[PDB]
C-alpha cells in the first residue's frame, strides 16, 4: 500500500503474497498479505472480519483487513520465523522433545479456541505456523474456505501442499469439522519429531495411497460411512495397516498413542483439540525456549 514500505517479500501465501512491511506512521513491523477479481465477496469480508475478533496468544493476531481497488490486503502481527524453517534450521539435529511437545501443546490450546469459537483453520502446514524468540508458536493464514473460499489456487499458478490433507477431504467431503485440523497437526507432530513429511503426496491421489500404505486401507469397519464417499472407488488397493512403532520411531509411547488419535480415520472418532491437552503426553510440559538464527 501508501502507508508501508515494503522491506522484504516474505513469501506466497494461500491466496496471494506476503511481505515483511513496516508502517510509514506507526513504524510498526508487519506481515501484509495481498489478495487479488472483478467486486470481491461481501461474505467474505464479513467472515473475514470475524477473524479480527478471534483474538488468542496461540493465534497470529489480525490487525486490519483494508479493502480497496480490487486488491485486499490482511494486516498482521509480525513473526520472527515459521516452523518449516526451523525444522529445515533443525535438520541435523531434531527439535529437542520438550519443544516439540511444547510447540504441541501450544498449538492444541490455539485450535481448542478456534474450534470453541467454531473456526477452522482448514490447511495448517509448517509453513503457516509461526515461532517467536520467546518459545511461543502460532497459528497464522487462516484458509477459511469460509471467507474468500477454497479455489484452485492462491491467485498466480503456485503449487498447493497436500501433505497435510485430512483423508476425509481426500475423499470429497463436503462439510469439513474441527477434526481436519487435527489430523493437520498430527501429521506435523510427526515430522517435529522424525525429521520427514509422513505422507509426502505429489498428487491428491498419491496423497490418499501414502496415507493408505501406513494407516491402512480404510473400510466399513474402522471408518463407518467411508465406502459411501464422495470419491472412494471400490477399486482401491487393499493395504495392510504398518506396525504403528515403524512410524513415528523413536517418539515414547505417550507421543505415540496421541498420535495415533490425532490420525483416527474416521474423524468421528479422532481426538478434539480440548481432549488431546489432557493426553498424559502433556503431563510433563515445559515451554523452552527456541534457538532461532534471524
Ligand atoms: N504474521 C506472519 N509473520 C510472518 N513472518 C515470517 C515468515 C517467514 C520468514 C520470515 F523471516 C518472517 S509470516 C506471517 C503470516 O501471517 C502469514 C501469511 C500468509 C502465509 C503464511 C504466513
Known amino acids: 500500500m501508501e502507508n508501508f514500505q515494503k522491506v522484504e517479500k516474505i513469501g506466497e501465501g494461500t491466496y496471494g503474497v506476503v511481505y515483511k512491511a513496516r508502517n510509514k506512521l506507526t513504524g510498526e513491523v508487519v506481515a501484509l498479505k495481498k489478495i487479488r477479481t472483478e467486486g470481491v465477496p461481501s461474505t467474505a469480508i464479513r467472515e473475514i472480519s470475524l477473524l479480527k475478533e478471534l483474538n488468542h496468544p496461540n493465534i497470529v493476531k489480525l490487525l486490519d483487513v483494508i479493502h480497496t481497488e480490487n486488491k485486499l490486503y490482511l494486516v498482521f502481527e509480525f513473526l520472527h520465523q515459521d516452523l518449516k524453517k526451523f525444522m529445515d534450521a533443525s535438520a541435523l539435529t531434531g527439535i529437542p522433545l520438550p519443544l516439540i511437545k511444547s510447540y504441541l501443546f501450544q498449538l492444541l490450546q490455539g485450535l481448542a479456541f478456534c474450534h470453541s469459537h467454531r473456526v477452522l483453520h482448514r490447511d495448517l502446514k509448517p509453513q ?17 474456505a469460509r471467507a474468500f473460499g477454497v479455489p484452485v489456487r492462491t491467485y498466480t499458478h503456485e503449487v498447493v501442499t497436500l501433505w497435510y490433507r485430512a483423508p476425509e477431504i481426500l475423499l470429497g467431503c463436503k462439510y469439513y469439522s474441527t477434526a481436519v ?26 496423497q490418499l495411497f501414502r496415507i493408505f500404505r501406513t494407516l491402512g486401507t480404510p473400510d466399513e469397519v474402522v471408518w463407518p460411512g467411508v465406502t459411501s464417499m464422495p470419491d472412494y472407488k471400490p477399486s482401491f488397493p487393499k493395504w495392510a495397516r504398518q506396525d504403528f512403532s515403524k512410524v513415528v520411531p523413536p517418539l515414547d509411547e505417550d507421543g505415540r498413542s496421541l498420535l495415533s488419535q490425532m490420525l483416527h480415520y474416521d474423524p468421528n472418532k479422532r481426538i478434539s483439540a480440548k481432549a488431546a491437552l489432557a493426553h498424559p503426553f502433556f503431563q510433563d510440559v515445559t515451554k523452552p525456549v527456541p534457538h532461532l538464527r534471524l
Open 128 to 144: 503457516n505456523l509461526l515461532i517467536n524468540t520467546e518459545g511461543a508458536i502460532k497459528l497464522a493464514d487462516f484458509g477459511l
Open 181 to 206: 485440523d487435527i489430523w493437520s497437526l498430527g501429521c506435523i507432530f510427526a515430522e517435529m519429531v522424525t525429521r520427514r513429511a509422513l505422507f509426502p503426496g505429489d498428487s491428491e491421489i498419491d
